[PDB]
Amino acid sequence: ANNVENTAKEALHQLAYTGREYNNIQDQIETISDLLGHSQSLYDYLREPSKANLTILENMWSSVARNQKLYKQIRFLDTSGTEKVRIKYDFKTSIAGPSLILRDKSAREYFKYAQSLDNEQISAWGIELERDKGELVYPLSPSLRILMPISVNDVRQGYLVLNVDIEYLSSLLNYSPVRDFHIELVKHKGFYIASPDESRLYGDIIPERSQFNFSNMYPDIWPRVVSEQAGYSYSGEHLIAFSSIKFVSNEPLHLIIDLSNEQLSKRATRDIND
Amino acid sequence: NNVENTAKEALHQLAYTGREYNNIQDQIETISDLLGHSQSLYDYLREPSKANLTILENMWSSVARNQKLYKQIRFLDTSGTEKVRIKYDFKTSIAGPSLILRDKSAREYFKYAQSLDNEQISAWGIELERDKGELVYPLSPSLRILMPISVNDVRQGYLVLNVDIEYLSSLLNYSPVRDFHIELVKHKGFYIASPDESRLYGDIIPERSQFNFSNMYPDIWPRVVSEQAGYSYSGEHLIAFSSIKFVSNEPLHLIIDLSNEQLSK
Numbered sequence: 001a002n003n004v005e006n007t008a009k010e011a012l013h014q015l016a017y018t019g020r021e022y023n024n025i026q027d028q029i030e031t032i033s034d035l036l037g038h039s040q041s042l043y044d045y046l047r048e049p050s051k052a053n054l055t056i057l058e059n060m061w062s063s064v065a066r067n068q069k070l071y072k073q074i075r076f077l078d079t080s081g082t083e084k085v086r087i088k089y090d091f092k093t094s095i096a097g098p099s100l101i102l103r104d105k106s107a108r109e110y111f112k113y114a115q116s117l118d119n120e121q122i123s124a125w126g127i128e129l130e131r132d133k134g135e136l137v138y139p140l141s142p143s144l145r146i147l148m149p150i151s152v153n154d155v156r157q158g159y160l161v162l163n164v165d166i167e168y169l170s171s172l173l174n175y176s177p178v179r180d181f182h183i184e185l186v187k188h189k190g191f192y193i194a195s196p197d198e199s200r201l202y203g204d205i206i207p208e209r210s211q212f213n214f215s216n217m218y219p220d221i222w223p224r225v226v227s228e229q230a231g232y233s234y235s236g237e238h239l240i241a242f243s244s245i246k247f248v249s250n251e252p253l254h255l256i257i258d259l260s261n262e263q264l265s266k267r268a269t270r271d272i273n274d
Numbered sequence: 275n276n277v278e279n280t281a282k283e284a285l286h287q288l289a290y291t292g293r294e295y296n297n298i299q300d301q302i303e304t305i306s307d308l309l310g311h312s313q314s315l316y317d318y319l320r321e322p323s324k325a326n327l328t329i330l331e332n333m334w335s336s337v338a339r340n341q342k343l344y345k346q347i348r349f350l351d352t353s354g355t356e357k358v359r360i361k362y363d364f365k366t367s368i369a370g371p372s373l374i375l376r377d378k379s380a381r382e383y384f385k386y387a388q389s390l391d392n393e394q395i396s397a398w399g400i401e402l403e404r405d406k407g408e409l410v411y412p413l414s415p416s417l418r419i420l421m422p423i424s425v426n427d428v429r430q431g432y433l434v435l436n437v438d439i440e441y442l443s444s445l446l447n448y449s450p451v452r453d454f455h456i457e458l459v460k461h462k463g464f465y466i467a468s469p470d471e472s473r474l475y476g477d478i479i480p481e482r483s484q485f486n487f488s489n490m491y492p493d494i495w496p497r498v499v500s501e502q503a504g505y506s507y508s509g510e511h512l513i514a515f516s517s518i519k520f521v522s523n524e525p526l527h528l529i530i531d532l533s534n535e536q537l538s539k
């Protein structure tokens with residue numbers, strides 16, 4: 001009536017809801033990585049890299065990939081950063097299998113970061129677009145790479161790497177049918193990682209899109225996004241509700257619900273909009 | 275009645291879409307020919323400097339961005355190694371060169387290409403894209419336009435355009451106003467495009483062999499294979515169908531398949 005104050009409150013409830021969902025995803029990720037990092041089939045492959053042991057290991061990772069769905073790759077890299085084992089998974093089809101396409105990944109920052117981790121420490125590099133030989137993969141694939149150095153008798157043997165597939169995950173989590181909000185994902189430095197609007201994505205990397213930065217678009221609301229854990233602002237052309245979460249990597253990840261005046265107007269609505 | 279009225283509207287829609295594919299084929303023929311006879315390809319072949327490579331890649335990138343339907347434009351040498359490769363991504367509109375250049379000599383489209391005359395434009399049947407023999411995911415069915423390029427009657431290699439069947443079907447196969455979803459079925463009986471991803475490519479993906487029009491509608495398939503535009507209603511599904519030749523010589527079948535529940539608007 002009264003609609004801005006009440007939409008805001010709805011949107012904050014949705015952000016709390018969704019942050020709890022990413023929290024749970026994070027927990028699953030830690031569990032899977034830890035089981036994979038300690039499996040006998042991995043240790044067998046490390047001791048004796050036979051075609052047979054490799055097959056057992058790939059078969060396990062493919063099963064896990066089909067079961068869990070959020071990993072578009074699962075890899076073992078050696079101490080030099082060269083891929084030794086590689087499973088790819090495609091969520092549209094549900095197909096998982098091995099690849100013989102194996103690259104030197106040592107120039108990548110996520111590898112350089114993985115090296116700094118303790119043996120068996122599970123962490124992640126910020127969300128970043130996938131690449132092949134330094135070239136962007138298309139369609140564009142933002143990924144959160146789970147990194148775990150693997151040791152035998154406390155000697156480091158390589159790195160387990162899981163590419164969690166941020167497009168898939170935002171599709172799964174960021175639209176809420178009942179409350180009908182589209183949550184967008186905004187990086188620690190203001191660029192878009194996920195949105196129903198594909199054109200605003202990845203301004204830090206695609207040069208034509210450098211102007212799609214929350215601080216540029218909202219240059220007075222941005223400081224609150226950075227500082228506060230959650231709040232909202234009404235401009236009043238847009239209602240913006242925001243929150244931050246830690247999603248595996250140490251970088252804050254911002255959750256944004258951004259509604260035009262026109263979208264705020266429709267929200268005198270009914271449950272036949274199911 | 276209803277099934278019969280819906281049948282006629284489907285047939286109108288199929289002839290509409292047939293005409294769109296006909297027009298697309300004409301575009302393709304004309305662009306391919308222009309590219310095969312271009313100054314910039316000519317200059318690069320005669321003198322493959324990086325300056326000439328740059329000029330060519332820039333040309334092919336702007337053609338990709340202009341035309342939208344090619345997901346790659348390549349030059350392969352006579353031994354089937356890629357020398358020039360432009361990728362295009364229609365969702366972003368981004369086109370650009372790749373340095374990921376492969377030996378494509380084991381591929382059937384390449385062996386087919388080798389069989390063509392100099393300056394002849396033909397096409398290989400629709401086939402999923404691969405990287406070192408491994409399927410590209412997301413799965414990408416492609417219609418490859420092939421043209422051997424020569425100077426002084428000596429073959430220099432092959433211009434290859436990857437026409438991006440997923441893009442094309444998402445563009446042409448749904449019409450909001452009649453509200454029909456046209457599926458593409460291969461001469462094979464296997465599905466090439468459909469709103470239902472899970473039935474696609476039953477010749478290639480294991481565990482999808484049962485998704486063959488001949489298997490699903492054994493007594494309707496002969497009508498489709500005959501290449502005639504018509505329909506059949508089996509009391510549970512109405513199928514309307516027509517066939518076109520889209521660049522290659524093989525017939526491609528356009529299918530509107532509606533269940534009783536869909537029908538039943």
Ligand code: NA
Pocket residue numbers: 105108131132133134135
């Ligand atoms: Na790379």
